[PDB]
Symmetry: D2
Subunit: 115 residues, 4 copies
């Protein structure tokens, strides 16, 4: 698991469950092409997005469908989605956790890169 | 205005208005002496807490009454308050806070 | 001033000065049309991006060039940029962002 | 494990390792009395702070010694520590995770309350 995504709900203080997540990789023509996707589990985590063989160096976009999460709960959101864009780098053994903390009109995201 | 507070509401996408803020200073007997207090304005800002003369060196605690804010809004909060503790020795301090019911962030802007 | 951006630096405790910001609007062909751009001032604020006439309904993307900011500071950043995507239909939007090398937050203040 | 604390470093994108954490509970005279403490592990997590029998309803303060963390790394910090203050409530099965995301001049904290 070189790339895991964790999503939290700052209104209810809970994992954000069943949130769609799309990962894209930048192509040579600088377009976004689909790379992996899934939905967060009961724990707010999305594992198994990709493999080490597939997850080569490049520019990646993680798109979290926050609007659909909030609208299902009957809470009015501002953003279309949360977007996390980064270049991956093979510098020793590394696993990327992309955490997102969601509020209706705000989000924060952090990358935890561990050996 | 050596110490200013600005508070935003991450649920409503608005300034957090009429938020109570209390500032304490650590006294010689290691107790928290009341130093200043006020409420955020319609812009979410709290000016005029103190003066350059009054704002001496020391350890300060800024307590932002987030619980009463969420309760007035009709929302269940987790935290009792947001606390910001720092040492002063940097002329102007702005303590910014962003509030959600189960999360907050605070940043110091020192100019 | 219907769309404003404010950026803070969580490492230095300062406004994030001279940060490039680009605004795009989703076009009829589902491409991102350049809409407006500018740089944050010494206060970390970016005013004058657009006008009420120009800022029509639509889907907007605000891209804040965080990578170049950290690189100019001499710090290794994780993100390419901070992206904020929203639909407009609410008169004044302030997009606030708080930057760290491996984390950022963004909040919308709609007044 | 009814109370776990997780601390992350937003400058290096890593767990914040070996950070001292002190937990206090509010006494009847409204003083803070020591309740539990520890240091974060290699993963930035602190487990085993307390037991369900000990962790009764009340007002708790979690004090994270952020200043000592930053000073050891040679990065100048603003805060003395990060303080997280909350009332615990027994409403069904519950575990509290107190997460803190640290930067030299900023921190965020979130509570994740799971069944």
């Amino acid at each position: 698991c070189p790339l895991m995504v964790k999503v939290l709900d700052a209104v209810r203080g809970s994992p954000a469950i069943n949130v769609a997540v799309h990962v894209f990789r930048k192509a040579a023509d600088d377009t976004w092409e689909p790379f992996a996707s899934g939905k967060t589990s009961e724990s707010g985590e999305l594992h198994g997005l990709t493999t080490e063989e597939e997850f080569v160096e490049g520019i990646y976009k993680v798109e979290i469908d926050t609007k659909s999460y909030w609208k299902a709960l009957g809470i009015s959101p501002f953003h279309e989605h949360a977007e996390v864009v980064f270049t991956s780098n093979d510098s020793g053994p590394r696993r990327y956790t992309i955490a997102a903390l969601l509020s209706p009109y705000s989000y924060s995201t952090t990358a935890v890169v561990t050996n």
